[model samples]
Target: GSSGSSGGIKDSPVNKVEPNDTLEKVFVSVTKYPDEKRLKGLSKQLDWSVRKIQCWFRHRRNQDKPSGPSSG
Candidate 1:
């Protein structure tokens, strides 16, 4: 019989950002480029999953970036 572990399946938590968990306060207060450890700590403080925190940070940065010039 083959070992099931041979496939190297990983177990990752299923996480989501609740609608009520707005990013305004944390996003405005944090540095544009925050350290990973700092983000993880903030995640716990906000009661948000790590993935949600990461995604929010990423999205916020993208939103803050300057837009490209439109093609004439």
Candidate 2:
């Protein structure tokens, strides 16, 4: 079954469109959690599933921050 990524993580298909920066920089730069209307709107423009964009945004946004340890 098609599962996970060769690059790691359950990511977009290699043959398909990878997380494009075309809209991401602008989208995330202006607002990290721009949801619903814009995400769907952006998802619309990206010609991709809303879930993909949502997860992509969430995953990408996480990397920009520091999730410090709870007990360490």
Candidate 3:
């Protein structure tokens, strides 16, 4: 599980950025699940907005869909 303010990245099996994957790809994959349970404490994770997260994810998905690495 992720510590303090980090989301569930450490615990997520599929939420990983591969060596060939770009940050945009990671952002895309991250947005697919906007209602993640870990995001319960909105105030705890400062400097991040739910809308921003959602938008970032959507943008990443669109940008990376063409050249993004294949998920295992």
Candidate 4:
């Protein structure tokens, strides 16, 4: 009998966004916007790519803004 080679394992997808409750709380604590340095640090600490971090910030900012006409 010949031994079979093990080389067909599937790796997890890199684009998957697994929500981290702690990270969410941290994001909320920030003053709605994250600086470039802070975003980079959060990306590393949260195991998320920089783009994902950016997207999160954009979404969070939109969420916090009031839905009304601009007063300019």
How many residue pairs clash per model? 0, 0, 0, 0
Q: List the RMSD of every prediction in angstroms.
A: 16.3, 13.5, 15.9, 16.9
Residue 13 local lDDT, model 4? 31
lDDT of 3 at 3: 54
Instruction: Rank the candidate models, highest TM-score first.
Output: 2, 4, 1, 3
lDDT for each candidate structure: 0.57, 0.60, 0.45, 0.59
What are the per-residue Cα lDDT tens digits for candidate 3 across 1-72? 665655543322355432323334434455444564534433244345555455555555554455544455
| lDDT of prediction 2 | 0.60
The RMSD (Cα, Å) of candidate 4 is 16.9
lDDT of 1: 0.57
Model 2 off-target regions past 4 Å? 1-17, 66-72
The better candidate by lDDT, 2 or 4, is 2
Report the CA-based lDDT of candidate 3 relative to the real structure: 0.45
Question: Least lDDT summed over 10 consecutive residues: which range in candidate 3?
Answer: 17-26
Per-residue C-alpha lDDT of model 1 across residues 5-46, encoded as one tens digit per residue: 355564432333334235545666666556677766766677
